[PDB]
Amino acid sequence: MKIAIVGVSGAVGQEFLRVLSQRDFPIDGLYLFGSSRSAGSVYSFKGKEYVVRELKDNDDFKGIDIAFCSAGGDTSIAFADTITRHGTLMIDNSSAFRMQEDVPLVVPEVNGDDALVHPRNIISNPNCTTIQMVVALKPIEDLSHIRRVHVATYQAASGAGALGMAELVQQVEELARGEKPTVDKFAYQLMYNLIPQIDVFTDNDYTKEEMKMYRETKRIMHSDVMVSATCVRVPVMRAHSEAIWVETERPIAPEEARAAFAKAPGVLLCDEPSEKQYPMPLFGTEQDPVIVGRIRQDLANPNGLVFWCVSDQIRKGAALNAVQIAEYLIAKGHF
């Protein structure tokens, strides 16, 4: 396979290089692309060094089998025709195509078969917090149809890219040094704070991030489920956490949910109250699973189940999910 990474400079682009090597993805040639800013930069991959080329509207994607894109929705909209011009499959981490009926929105553990039909030769990687949630919801859905979800998120600085991570760490330095915290990538100081706004507001006063959890979940799960989210930025480095209440059509006891989670692909059950075993972002960082715990009956609804889950936003919330889409297609002989 000949593989492209479009947008290699940033956090997700760098994770693509790590994941593709950790998972021994079958590569016979690698092509790195960026803006004029990263053109000419050098990266090493599996012993060879590669030079980034500026993404231009040309024929650079002739002969490339898959392009993993982590360059922003503006780039993906502007250059989709270029990337797919010679039959390359574009697996896009951006939000650009997530609502297009002719472009599949795929989490392999949930709806991997949707990946097999791509009229535009584009497949969309879903929103990070949505991937996390539906990996956990799928084994529950298979026990009883999920009608409603309430979710409060606790989203890491990494959701705002590397610059968001850098702002947080510097604020830590300025606070231990009695200095002035610097505020720019976030709307307010993040250290010692919580910002209940992620992305811009929409006309129903939910944010775009909250509406993604509503709209993307329906597509992925092929479901009429209704998700109402409150998305909050928190002073955590790069794993996202979610407090989830699910309402199903019949009651699911914690023991049944536990059994389902323990067998569910992509899930790690971590739920031992008496040993203080529960998912935490500090320990879910740089791990593959969606980590699930604090499972209990919903005191407010006999048909409700409550739990808590954590996932690494750069891995399963982005690069890992995209690589798993490609792996799923390979296993189906798509190439």
Ligand X SMILES: Nc1ncnc2c1ncn2[C@@H]1O[C@H](COP(=O)(O)O)[C@@H](O)[C@H]1OP(=O)(O)O
Q: Which residues bind ligand X (CB under 6 A)?
A: 6-13, 33-35, 37-38, 55, 70-72, 75, 161-162
Instruction: Give me the least distance between CB of 157 and ligand X, in Å please.
Output: 12
Of 67 and 151, which CB lies nearer to a copy of itself in the complex structure?
151
Residues pairing with 48 in the sheet:
45
d(CA 65, CA 33): 15
Of the candidates 152, 157, 154, the residue with the CA atom closest to the CA atom of residue 186: 157
Establish whether 240 is a catalytic residue: yes
Which stretch in 37-45, 63-71, 93-101, 185-193 sits in contact with a copy of itself by CB under 8 A? 185-193
Distances (CA, A) of 311 to 131, 204, 266: 9, 28, 10
d(CA 228, CA 151): 6
Instruction: Select the residue interacting with a copy of itself from 48, 49, 176, 184 (CB under 8 A).
Output: 176
Instruction: Give me the least distance between CB of 74 and a copy of itself, in Å please.
Output: 23
Instruction: Select the residue interacting with a copy of itself from 27, 78, 162, 280 (CB under 8 A).
Output: 280
Residues between 198 and 227 that touch a copy of itself (CB under 8 A): 201, 204-206, 214, 226-227
Of the candidates 292, 256, 297, the residue with the CA atom closest to the CA atom of residue 272: 292
Of 97 and 307, which CB lies nearer to ligand X in the complex structure?
97
Question: Taking CB within 5 to 8 Å according to partner kind, which of ligand X, a copy of itself, none is near residue 11?
Answer: ligand X
d(CA 268, CA 291): 5
Sign of CA dihedral 70, 76, 78, 82: positive
Which stretch in 25-33, 72-80, 303-311, 317-325 sits in contact with a copy of itself by CB under 8 A? 303-311
Question: Taking CB within 5 to 8 Å according to partner kind, which of ligand X, a copy of itself, none is near residue 297?
Answer: a copy of itself
Amino acid type, 174? E
Burial pattern 55-67, b for ≥16 Cβ within 10 A else e, equals beeeebbeebbbb
Is residue 162 part of the contact set for a copy of itself (CB under 8 A)? no
Question: Helices (DSSP H) in the chain: which residue ranges?
Answer: 11-22, 73-83, 108-111, 128-141, 161-176, 208-221, 254-263, 281-284, 320-331
Residues between 64 and 93 that touch a copy of itself (CB under 8 A): none
Catalytic, out of 118, 240, 270, 309: 240
d(CA 59, CA 20): 24
Of 47 and 178, which CB lies nearer to a copy of itself in the complex structure?
178
Catalytic, out of 128, 231, 270, 309: 128
- Do 93 and 64 touch, CB atoms closer than 8 A? no
Instruction: Give me the least distance between CB of 146 and a copy of itself, in Å please.
Output: 10
d(CA 182, CA 188): 9
Instruction: Give me the least distance between CB of 177 and a copy of itself, in Å please.
Output: 7
d(CA 167, CA 199): 17
Residue 74: partners with Cβ closer than 8 Å, 6 or more residues away: 96
Of 23 and 148, which CB lies nearer to a copy of itself in the complex structure?
148
Q: Which residues are catalytic?
A: 128, 240
Residues making contact with a copy of itself (CB under 8 A): 148-150, 152, 154, 172-173, 175-177, 187-189, 191-197, 201, 204-206, 214, 226-228, 230, 232, 234-237, 241, 243, 245, 247, 254, 273-274, 276, 278-282, 293-301, 304, 306, 308
